[PDB]
């Protein structure tokens, strides 16, 4: 539209909330492959932060491409290097969600703040494969990664 | 005349051919099949089938196991789970395997495992004694 | 609030596995049960107490076995039964606003009793 | 009866072992050409 | 619909068309390989059947057991392969059960197991997965034969249903009988066979069972790959035929949008 | 017009719903297996 | 021109079998090699903010990549190789780069010297 | 369009004839899922009539939802319940078609008036499954379901 | 679009230069199948010209269709007639290429101007099979057919 299209040029950072992601229940609905920034550079935020951010984006984009094939084949037919990609991408999608302190009225959960180091470490680990043994729903609406581990344990126990 | 059909799951050697005589191993013991042999069914031992064509040439194939049917109409069907020409084998390997199998023969883990060792031993025994 | 907290979540889960195991088969069964419970007539609204009664009956699992095409009638019949037998419970739920533990037990008894004698 | 059948084997197993032996006793060249088309991938499910 | 709706639909259909085109390419590759490998397996299996063909062994009709081995794969998108095989399986099972015979069913492939797990759910004796991912080998047939013999089911008769590969366009759901040494021994046609005690006979029966299973696997794999080739070719053609109409509609709607916006602008300009 | 990546989900047609359902099925199965494995590991690790 | 003339064709061939890339297997060695060369060529064209390369260095990198001295390398490492190989060539063989820059052509003498450099470096990686 | 869009609010019962159906040869081309009425009330038309009409609409809507997949992955990629639904939906689509008296010169077929009870009965039977053995074409351009059975018999020979 | 829609009401013919034929080395790139004309009518151009053009189009369409099968089922599974049509189609494709007096500096070959009758004769002969016994490259970038025969001789001497 002309109005947002024109505003895009006047911002140093845009976080395009998306309706499709909000339909999946991920809140905030921020669209990882459409939110950009001007300080997302290896010089301003550091090498490791940049590598992790780009890794998250690339894995999500690969997952987007794979969904087209999953349309026809089904998911049993996917190779074993891609079922891993899809599983990791779903885990990352869930982990990007978070409960806010002003949304306690809706979700009921407790709002959390995740310092930068916790986010970078958690996404590093999810990408590396250090959590292939936890179900994806373990990451839904949690703060740091350790809380996802604790939630996975609680789901297992109550199973 | 004889209609010979020699086949492995993977490949085929003779297919309704016309050979004169074919010498096959067996559990009940070696025998040769000629143009009107009496009907039989048998299952092979690891040995080497020899085929003599209408003209006088011998082709030797080591077969590991399978079956051989000689029918009323003088049609031989020789199916082998693994058939290989003798040039496709190496002594050193087979002899080392035979010695290894004998070495494990002392370790009679059980009647089953003993059986498997014995089968390996005789298979390698025929391998060497046909290669050597 | 109490009943809807569970009901909305169960429907939310069932809505992503609708285009079709044991656990998930139970999930779909429950979702279809709830969806048949959300249907309604026309020009026939219900008191909040009856709405919560039937939603509780359907969401605790007291309809996980009854046939789908029968819930549409079960609900109806069930409502009449309560409105004809246990109006005191509905009045208590409505006045108290919340579903008290004794009220919850009374509802449990009533739901199981009607279920057994409904077939 | 035969000695292997005494343990209860079947001729299928006997042929498996014999064929495995012959396969193991092939030239280094033909191993790469016979190792495939020999293995099995099927797997069973409890009933 | 709105221009955005048609744009999104057209993009998705283009994606699907590309996916099915690549799928047809892959299925063609696998089918060429399988039809290359089916040449020797065809003569091998025909040789295996030779005996029971040219010395006919009809089973004594006063038995009680049977077996039905249906052959198929795990993967779908292959026409009515699994459908035809399961239909034949259930047809034969019901026909036999009419006579009171206690049938049992072995499915090779998950699809066969699933299609028959509603009715005939109990009759299943064992089933196998991971079929068709790689070309079947004699190892696979020997595994099936072993898992059959070991299972404490002494079937008196049996049939195996599979899809004989007639041509890259057509296949026929064929059925081959398979007997048991109890039947083989007491068949008059076997009197003419020498050196047949009741031991070589059933070593030979075990081997014959493995042979027929392997033959059916090879036939069914070739048929399945040809069917997937055809099905994905048809799907790609349907997708392209749909993209034709969607592109025409998209161009019409794009022009309509341009005209409408322009008319609004000029009508505003004139009004002032 | 051209084709993007992951447009089947965007279109939202029957195929998109079929995506989301099939994927949820598969990962429900895997999550059940992983939860079972987590419980069993917990029991095997109390010792 | 000498190098990009063939790089353009290699990428053109890759772009028309890109769809298989996911399936990857189940296809002959022809398309397999096509889309194994295409991936390497693609990963050579990645570049970073504000770091343009001299023409001779681009020519050297594309030469290594397209003549075939990279098809035996895992794609993920290609970039590293580049970022290493480049520096190596910048340090030791400045004379060759000067000759390419001035002559503006890859003389067969320079072609041979460059092949030797690439082979020697790729050996020790 | 503004003209029909505006007139939709002045009518009790609408009947949306659609070119897509007419191109299939069905006539009258009425679109079952766009036609509406204000007396489709269980208290006005009874309960059997309302239930049959709503079952017909439900099954036609399900088939319409399936059509997107069917048009590409063929009918060989549907569950068994889906195949059965598609068969019923095609039977019903055909059975809705009728030959009019004024269209004799076009079609040549004799025009039929189907009483309401016969219509309800026929659709109730098609939905129950009493006619899963007949072919679709047995229902094309017939009056009450008796003629459908008769035409199926004629085709069977 | 209104612009090409209005333009095409006046076009008496169409020539479709295609990249996919410059890659194959055939020049001019004119696409033999997309290219059309209003005067491809036996009344206008004549019966023999029309029949030759129709024959070339038919054989080229057949080769286009068979290219997919060759690319899928393999070449070894084509009948003798199919292989003969493939040979004819490849020879015709190469024969359509011509050297231009203005593109001498590119090809180096001296340019040729093939008169109409010689073109019709050459394609009649190629289609009838008179030249089934010549190599494909004997036809690449030649003028009349007789020049193709001369090239065929000189490439085996």
Please give the radius of gyration of chain D in angstroms.
14 Å
How many structural domains of chain C?
Answer: 1
Q: How do the helices and strands follow one another from N- to C-terminus of chain C?
A: HHHHHH
Strand content of chain D: 5-15%
Percentage of residues assigned to helices of chain D = 40-55%
PDB class: hydrolase
Keywords: ATP synthase, mitochondria, complex, hydrolase
Entry title: bovine ATP synthase monomer state 2 (combined)
Chains A, H, I: ATP synthase subunit beta, mitochondrial
Offer a few descriptive terms:
part of a larger assembly; 9 chains; E: 272 residues; alpha/beta; 2 domains; 5-stranded mixed sheet; 5 strands; 61% helix; elongated; F: 47 residues; mainly alpha; 2 helices; rod-shaped
Please give a structural write-up.
The structure is cut from a larger assembly and holds three copies of chain A, one copy of chain B (132 residues), two copies of chain C, one copy of chain D (47 residues), one copy of chain E (272 residues) and one copy of chain F (47 residues). Chain A is 52% helix and 3% strand. Chain A has one domain (40-159). Chain A is mainly alpha-helical. Chain B is of the alpha+beta class and 132 residues long. Chain B folds into two domains: 1-89, no CATH class; 90-132, no CATH class. Chain B has a five-stranded mixed sheet with strand order 2-1-9-8-5, with no helix packed on it. Chain B has a five-stranded antiparallel sheet with strand order 4-3-6-7-10. In chain B, α1 (91-105) runs antiparallel to α2. The N and C termini of chain B lie far apart (34 Å). With 47 residues, chain D is mostly helical. Chains in contact: A-E, A-F, A-G, B-D, B-E, C-F, D-E, E-F, E-G, E-H, E-I, F-H. The B-D interface holds B 10, 27, 43, 46, 62, 64-66, 81-82, 84, 88-90, 93-94, 97, 110-112, 114-116, 118-120, 123-124, 127 and D 2-4, 6-9, 11, 14-19, 21-28, 30, 37. Chain A: Belongs to the ATPase alpha/beta chains family. Chain A: This is ATP synthase F(1) complex catalytic subunit beta, mitochondrial. Chain A: The modification N6-acetyllysine is found at residues 58, 112, 117, 154.
């Amino acid at each position: 539209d002309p109005a947002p299209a024109t505003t895009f040029a006047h911002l140093d950072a845009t976080t395009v909330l998306s309706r499709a992601i909000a339909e999946l229940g991920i809140y905030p609905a921020v669209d990882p492959l459409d939110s950009t920034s001007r300080i997302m550079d290896p010089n301003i935020v550091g090498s490791e932060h940049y590598d992790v951010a780009r890794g998250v984006q690339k894995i999500l984009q690969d997952y987007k491409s794979l969904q087209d094939i999953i349309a026809i084949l089904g998911m049993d037919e996917l190779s074993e290097e891609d079922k891993l990609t899809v599983s990791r991408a779903r885990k990352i999608q869930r982990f990007l969600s978070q409960p806010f302190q002003v949304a306690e009225v809706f979700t009921g959960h407790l709002g959390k703040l995740v310092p930068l180091k916790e986010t970078i470490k958690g996404f590093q680990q999810i990408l590396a494969g250090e959590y292939d043994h936890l179900p994806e729903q373990a990451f839904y609406m949690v703060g740091p990664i350790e809380e996802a581990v604790a939630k996975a344990d609680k789901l297992a126990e109550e199973h | 005349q004889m209609s010979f059909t020699f086949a492995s799951p993977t490949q085929v050697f003779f297919n309704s051919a016309n050979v004169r005589q074919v010498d096959v191993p067996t559990q009940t013991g070696a025998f040769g099949i000629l143009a009107a042999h009496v009907p039989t069914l048998q299952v092979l031992r690891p040995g080497l089938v020899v085929v003599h064509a209408e003209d006088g040439t011998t082709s030797k194939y080591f077969v590991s196991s399978g079956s051989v049917t000689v029918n009323a109409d003088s049609s031989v069907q020789l199916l082998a789970e693994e058939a290989v020409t003798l040039d496709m084998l190496d002594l050193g390997a087979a002899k080392a395997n035979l010695e290894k199998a004998q070495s494990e023969l002392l370790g009679a883990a059980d009647e089953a495992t003993r059986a498997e060792i014995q089968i390996r031993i005789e298979a390698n025994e025929a391998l060497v004694k046909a290669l050597e | 609030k109490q009943v809807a907290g569970t009901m909305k979540l169960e429907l939310a889960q069932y809505r992503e596995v609708a285009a079709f195991d044991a656990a998930t088969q139970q999930l779909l069964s429950r979702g279809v049960r709830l969806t048949e419970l959300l249907k309604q007539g026309q020009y026939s609204p219900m008191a909040i107490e009856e709405q919560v009664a039937v939603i509780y009956a359907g969401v605790r699992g007291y309809l996980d076995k009854l046939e789908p095409s029968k819930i549409t009638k079960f609900e109806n019949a069930f409502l009449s039964h309560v409105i004809s037998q246990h109006q005191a419970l509905l009045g208590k739920i409505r006045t108290d606003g919340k579903i008290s533990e004794e009220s919850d037990a009374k509802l449990k008894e009533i739901v199981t009793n009607f279920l057994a004698g409904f077939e | 009866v035969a000695y292997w059948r005494q343990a209860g084997l079947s001729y299928i197993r006997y042929s498996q072992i014999c064929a495995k032996a012959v396969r193991d006793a092939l030239k280094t060249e033909f191993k790469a050409n016979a190792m495939k088309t020999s293995g099995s991938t099927i797997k069973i499910v409890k009933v | 619909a709105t221009l955005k709706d048609i744009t999104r639909r057209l993009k998705s259909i283009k994606n699907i068309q590309k996916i099915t085109k690549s799928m047809k390419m892959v299925a063609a590759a696998k089918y060429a390989r399988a039809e290359r490998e089916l040449k020797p397996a065809r003569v091998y299996g025909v040789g295996s059947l030779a005996l029971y063909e040219k010395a006919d062994i009809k089973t004594p009709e006063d038995k009680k057991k049977h077996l039905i081995i249906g052959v198929s794969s795990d993967r779908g998108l292959c026409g009515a392969i699994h459908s035809s095989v399961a239909k034949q399986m259930k047809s034969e099972a019901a026909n036999l059960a009419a006579a009171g015979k206690e049938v049992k069913i072995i499915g090779v492939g998950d699809k066969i197991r699933s299609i028959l797990h509603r009715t005939h759910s109990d009759q299943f004796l064992v089933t196998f997965k991971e079929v068709g991912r790689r070309p079947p080998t004699f190892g696979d047939a020997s595994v099936i034969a072993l898992e059959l013999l070991n299972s404490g089911y002494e079937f008196d008769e049996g049939s195996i249903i599979f899809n004989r590969f007639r041509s890259v366009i057509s296949y026929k759901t064929e059925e081959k009988p398979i007997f048991s040494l109890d039947t083989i021994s007491s068949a008059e046609s076997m009197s003419i066979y020498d050196d047949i005690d009741a031991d070589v006979l059933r070593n030979y029966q075990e081997y014959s069972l493995a042979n027929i299973i392997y033959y059916s696997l090879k036939e069914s794999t070739t048929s399945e790959q040809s069917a997937r080739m055809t099905a994905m070719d048809n799907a790609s053609k349907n997708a392209s035929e749909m993209i034709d109409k969607l592109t025409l509609t998209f161009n019409r709607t794009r022009q309509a949008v341009i005209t409408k916006e322009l008319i609004e602008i000029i009508s505003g300009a004139a009004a002032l | 017009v051209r084709s993007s990546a992951g447009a089947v989900r965007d279109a939202g047609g029957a195929f998109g719903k079929r995506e989301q359902a099939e994927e949820e099925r598969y990962f429900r199965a895997r999550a059940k297996e992983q939860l079972a494995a987590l419980k069993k590991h917990h029991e095997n690790e109390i010792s | 021109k000498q190098v990009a003339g063939t790089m353009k064709l290699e990428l053109a061939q890759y772009r028309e079998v890109a769809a298989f890339a996911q399936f990857g297997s189940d296809l002959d060695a022809a398309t397999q090699q096509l889309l194994s060369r295409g991936v390497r060529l693609t990963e050579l064209l990645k570049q970073g903010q504000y770091s343009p390369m001299a023409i001779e260095e681009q020519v050297a990198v594309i030469y290594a990549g397209v003549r075939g001295y990279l098809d035996k390398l895992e794609p993920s490492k290609i970039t590293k190789f580049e970022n290493a190989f480049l520096s190596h060539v910048i340090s030791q063989h400045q004379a060759l780069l000067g000759k390419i820059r001035t002559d503006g052509k890859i003389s067969e003498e320079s072609d041979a010297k460059l092949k030797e450099i690439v082979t020697n470096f790729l050996a020790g990686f």
